[PDB]
Amino acid sequence: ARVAVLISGTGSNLQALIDSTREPNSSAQIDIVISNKAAVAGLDKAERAGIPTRVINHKLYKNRVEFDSAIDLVLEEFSIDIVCLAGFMRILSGPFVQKWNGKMLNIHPSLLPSFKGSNAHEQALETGVTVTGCTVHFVAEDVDAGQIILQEAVPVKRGDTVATLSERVKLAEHKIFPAALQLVASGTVQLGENGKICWVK
Ligand SMILES: Nc1nc(=O)c2cc(CCCCc3ccc(C(=O)N[C@@H](CCC(=O)O)C(=O)O)s3)[nH]c2[nH]1
Ligand SMILES: NCC(=O)N[C@@H]1O[C@H](COP(=O)([O-])[O-])[C@@H](O)[C@H]1O
């Protein structure tokens, strides 16, 4: 399965995916990395790994649909099968989501359905949970509401900040995102007719 990874910053999840997809038994290969932000460290990581990169800024497009179409063009160019959102901090439009239904994965740093949105760690700390975690899910039109593939719980320590908590949760992210990509790319897991997750094996 040919994979595109979309990023907006540091790219630690990208690096974990690059590492995993180069294992001999990997069913996925990363053929393109796309960023909406220029000069971010995730681009350096891709380049260093010998993977092509494309930057697409919102300032060159009228609306969200034309922005996504520019993404889609590149996806089609590289004959992509699966899209991974790895620190990609943009909402995707309906038709784009619909086109890639069952083919697009996102990593989110909470145990969904808790703490949806762009500041999950802030929410978890504000709420005072002692257990948080991360979630890989299929992307549906409603944000962070798509079908869940894998999750991993991560403890919150007293005195945790966004800095220390996100560091701990990222170690879990780097485990389940490669595991989830491998499940989907090997055809072991799929979105299924009724919409709910289907373990084909
Ligand atoms: N259709 C859809 N379903 C999803 O399940 C899903 C997950 C993501 C992944 C992202 C979800 C977290 C985010 C929530 C809100 C954000 C936001 O408003 N981003 C700005 C970017 C501005 C900037 O920082 O430069 C924007 O969209 O314009 S980012 N994107 C998705 N889109
Ligand atoms: N809602 C999306 C979201 O909050 N994504 C989060 O952004 C970080 C990106 O780190 P990275 O650039 O080092 O992979 C990750 O922690 C990811 O879970």
Q: Resolution in Å, one decimal, please.
A: 2.1
List, by residue number, the catalytic residues: 108
Give the number of the atom of ligand 2 that is nearest the alpha carbon of residue 16.
14
> How many Cβ atoms sit within 10 Å of the Cβ of residue 165?
21
d(CA 94, CA 98): 6
Tell me if 55 CB under 6 Å of ligand 1.
Answer: no
Q: What domain range is 162 assigned to? A: 1-201
Max CA-CA distance within the chain? 48
| Experimental technique | X-ray
Number of domains in the chain: 1
Give the number of the atom of ligand 2 that is nearest the alpha carbon of residue 7.
12
Distance between Cα 50 and ligand 2 center (Å)? 22
The residues facing 89 across adjacent strands are none
What's the one-letter identity of residue 183?
L
Measuring from atom 13 of ligand 2, which residue has the nearest CA?
12
163 in Cβ contact with 124 (< 8 Å): no
What is the full DSSP assignment across the chain? -EEEEEESS--HHHHHHHHHHTSTT-S-EEEEEEESSTT-HHHHHHHHTT--EEE--GGG-SSHHHHHHHHHHHHHHTT-SEEEESS---PPPHHHHHHTTTTEEEEESS-TTSS-SS-HHHHHHHHT-SEEEEEEEE--SSTT-SPEEEEEEEEPPTT--HHHHHHHHHHHHHHHHHHHHHHHHTTSEE--TTSS-EE--
HSE-CB at 163 with a 13 A cutoff on CA atoms is 1
| Domain containing residue 40: CATH number | 3.40.50.170
Instruction: Give the list of residues 6+ apart from residue 109 with CB closer than 8 angstroms, or none.
Output: 120, 121, 132, 134, 166, 169, 170, 173
Distance between Cα 107 and ligand 2 center (Å)? 7
